[PDB]
Design an enzyme around this catalytic site. Structure first.
Site, mmCIF file in Angstrom:
data_model
loop_
_atom_site.group_PDB
_atom_site.id
_atom_site.type_symbol
_atom_site.label_atom_id
_atom_site.label_comp_id
_atom_site.label_asym_id
_atom_site.label_seq_id
_atom_site.Cartn_x
_atom_site.Cartn_y
_atom_site.Cartn_z
ATOM 1 N N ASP A 255 0.011 -7.511 1.708
ATOM 2 C CA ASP A 255 0.624 -6.367 1.630
ATOM 3 C C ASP A 255 2.029 -6.277 1.870
ATOM 4 O O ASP A 255 2.643 -6.088 2.686
ATOM 5 C CB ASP A 255 -0.003 -5.603 2.905
ATOM 6 C CG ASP A 255 0.059 -4.014 2.901
ATOM 7 O OD1 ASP A 255 0.665 -3.264 1.918
ATOM 8 O OD2 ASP A 255 -0.237 -3.121 3.905
ATOM 9 N N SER B 192 4.531 2.171 8.127
ATOM 10 C CA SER B 192 4.196 1.299 7.178
ATOM 11 C C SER B 192 5.323 0.743 6.211
ATOM 12 O O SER B 192 6.141 1.529 5.879
ATOM 13 C CB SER B 192 2.994 1.821 6.294
ATOM 14 O OG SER B 192 1.714 1.947 7.230
ATOM 15 N N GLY B 193 5.394 -0.531 6.016
ATOM 16 C CA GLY B 193 6.537 -0.973 5.209
ATOM 17 C C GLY B 193 7.501 -1.340 5.835
ATOM 18 O O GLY B 193 8.525 -2.054 5.252
ATOM 19 N N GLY C 81 2.983 6.224 8.610
ATOM 20 C CA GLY C 81 4.499 6.383 8.418
ATOM 21 C C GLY C 81 5.370 5.381 8.931
ATOM 22 O O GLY C 81 6.630 5.552 8.525
ATOM 23 N N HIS D 41 0.927 -1.007 -0.023
ATOM 24 C CA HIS D 41 -0.072 -0.061 0.059
ATOM 25 C C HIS D 41 0.848 1.412 -0.034
ATOM 26 O O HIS D 41 0.248 2.448 -0.146
ATOM 27 C CB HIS D 41 -0.979 0.137 1.153
ATOM 28 C CG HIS D 41 -0.532 0.329 2.410
ATOM 29 N ND1 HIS D 41 0.144 -0.635 3.592
ATOM 30 C CD2 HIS D 41 -0.084 1.419 3.133
ATOM 31 C CE1 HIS D 41 0.451 0.433 4.540
ATOM 32 N NE2 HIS D 41 0.350 1.616 4.306
HETATM 33 C C1 LIG Z 1 -5.988 4.700 9.853
HETATM 34 C C2 LIG Z 1 -5.497 3.400 9.484
HETATM 35 N N1 LIG Z 1 -4.290 3.378 8.919
HETATM 36 C C3 LIG Z 1 -3.426 2.328 8.784
HETATM 37 O O1 LIG Z 1 -3.510 1.041 9.355
HETATM 38 C C4 LIG Z 1 -2.138 2.452 7.848
HETATM 39 C C5 LIG Z 1 -1.655 1.460 6.813
HETATM 40 C C6 LIG Z 1 -2.920 1.125 5.855
HETATM 41 C C7 LIG Z 1 -4.021 1.695 5.736
HETATM 42 C C8 LIG Z 1 -5.132 0.989 4.899
HETATM 43 C C9 LIG Z 1 -4.801 -0.234 4.333
HETATM 44 C C10 LIG Z 1 -3.510 -0.910 4.600
HETATM 45 C C11 LIG Z 1 -2.504 -0.011 5.583
HETATM 46 N N2 LIG Z 1 -0.812 2.261 8.708
HETATM 47 C C12 LIG Z 1 -0.515 2.922 9.682
HETATM 48 O O2 LIG Z 1 -1.105 3.793 10.256
HETATM 49 C C13 LIG Z 1 0.658 1.865 9.919
HETATM 50 F F1 LIG Z 1 1.752 2.540 9.604
HETATM 51 F F2 LIG Z 1 0.507 1.583 11.534
HETATM 52 F F3 LIG Z 1 0.366 0.674 9.443
HETATM 53 C C14 LIG Z 1 -6.706 2.436 9.262
HETATM 54 O O3 LIG Z 1 -7.718 2.779 8.458
HETATM 55 N N3 LIG Z 1 -6.400 1.080 9.420
HETATM 56 C C15 LIG Z 1 -7.292 0.221 9.092
HETATM 57 C C16 LIG Z 1 -8.095 0.189 7.900
HETATM 58 C C17 LIG Z 1 -8.771 -0.556 7.385
HETATM 59 C C18 LIG Z 1 -9.045 -1.757 7.934
HETATM 60 C C19 LIG Z 1 -9.776 -3.102 7.139
HETATM 61 F F4 LIG Z 1 -8.676 -3.677 6.738
HETATM 62 F F5 LIG Z 1 -10.293 -3.945 8.231
HETATM 63 F F6 LIG Z 1 -10.670 -2.576 6.314
HETATM 64 C C20 LIG Z 1 -8.116 -2.113 8.999
HETATM 65 C C21 LIG Z 1 -7.220 -1.179 9.814
#
Ligand SMILES: C[C@H](NC(=O)[C@H](Cc1ccccc1)NC(=O)C(F)(F)F)C(=O)Nc1ccc(C(F)(F)F)cc1
Ligand SMILES: [Ca+2]
Length: 240
Positions: free
Chosen positions: A93, A188-189, A186, A45
């Site tokens: 991912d 992520s990855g 930030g 992502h």
């Molecule tokens: C705000 C939060 N952001 C996150 O989880 C984003 C990375 C991300 C976002 C979308 C897709 C993949 C990865 N990352 C971060 O904040 C991290 F660095 F900790 F990973 C979020 O929305 N997390 C989230 C979103 C959707 C789902 C679902 F997959 F269940 F739908 C689970 C958690």
């Protein structure tokens, strides 16, 4: 990283910063792990946007010359064939980036050690998350590399209803969930470094946190389980 401490300059030398060009400057967007002199492992992502990317190895303070940085362009991006942007909860991912040139290894730039295929950690295994991500939910990026102690939460506990339920799969590692320490945007990855037989190996690629916040009690940070992808990694490098 929420609830982290600043990392020493040479503690985690496979850590890279993945940056994209914005205007004239370059901005940090994700972490990654150097796995060959010309290959980086990161989250699929982080490269969903068609941006110009560069990688920074030997980096410690994003906003200041450390005297140890090497800046390399990203020449080819290979994301997992099954990755789907609209469903991070499906997994996959992960992405590999071929660098425009080979970086020089020294004490600030080293290859990350990958686990054996199939390796699952026992619950509450000792691991550290590292990165320059937000230090508070809805906060700002860290200037210097942060680290936090984030013990593993096994699949049976993480997929239970009070935790993540069905959102987490067995192709993922959960770590943390104490309401205090966590990965955040930030990070992520980047790596989840876990001590296995006296050696730190990169067992996770940071993938997601709760919509509700980065440090949420019983919502561990979620990582792509690298040991589920060893054959794919080797088949990509072997052909490119
Ligand atoms: C705000 C939060 N952001 C996150 O989880 C984003 C990375 C991300 C976002 C979308 C897709 C993949 C990865 N990352 C971060 O904040 C991290 F660095 F900790 F990973 C979020 O929305 N997390 C989230 C979103 C959707 C789902 C679902 F997959 F269940 F739908 C689970 C958690
Ligand atoms: Ca710097």
């Amino acid at each position: 990283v929420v609830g982290g401490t600043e990392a020493q300059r040479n503690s985690w030398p496979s850590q890279i910063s993945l940056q994209y060009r914005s205007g004239s400057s370059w901005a940090h967007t994700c972490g990654g792990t150097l796995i060959r002199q010309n290959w980086v492992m990161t989250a699929a992502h982080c490269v969903d946007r068609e941006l110009t990317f560069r990688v920074v190895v030997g980096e410690h303070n994003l906003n200041q010359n450390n005297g140890t940085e090497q800046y390399v362009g990203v020449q080819k991006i290979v994301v997992h064939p099954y990755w789907n942007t609209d469903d991070v909860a499906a997994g996959y991912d992960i992405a590999l980036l071929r660098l425009a040139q080979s970086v020089t290894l020294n004490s600030y730039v080293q290859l990350g050690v990958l686990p054996r295929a199939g390796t699952i950690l026992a619950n509450n295994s000792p691991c550290y998350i590292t990165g320059w991500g937000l230090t508070r939910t809805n906060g700002q990026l860290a200037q210097t590399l942060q680290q936090a102690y984030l013990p593993t939460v096994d699949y049976a506990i993480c997929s239970s209803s009070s935790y993540w339920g069905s959102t987490v799969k067995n192709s993922m590692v959960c770590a943390g969930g104490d309401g205090v320490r966590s990965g955040c945007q930030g990070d992520s990855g980047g790596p989840l470094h876990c001590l296995v037989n006296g050696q730190y190996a990169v067992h996770g690629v940071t993938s997601f946190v709760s919509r509700l916040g980065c440090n949420v009690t019983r919502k561990p940070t979620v990582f792509t389980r690298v040991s589920a992808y060893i054959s794919w990694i080797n088949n990509v490098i072997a052909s490119n």
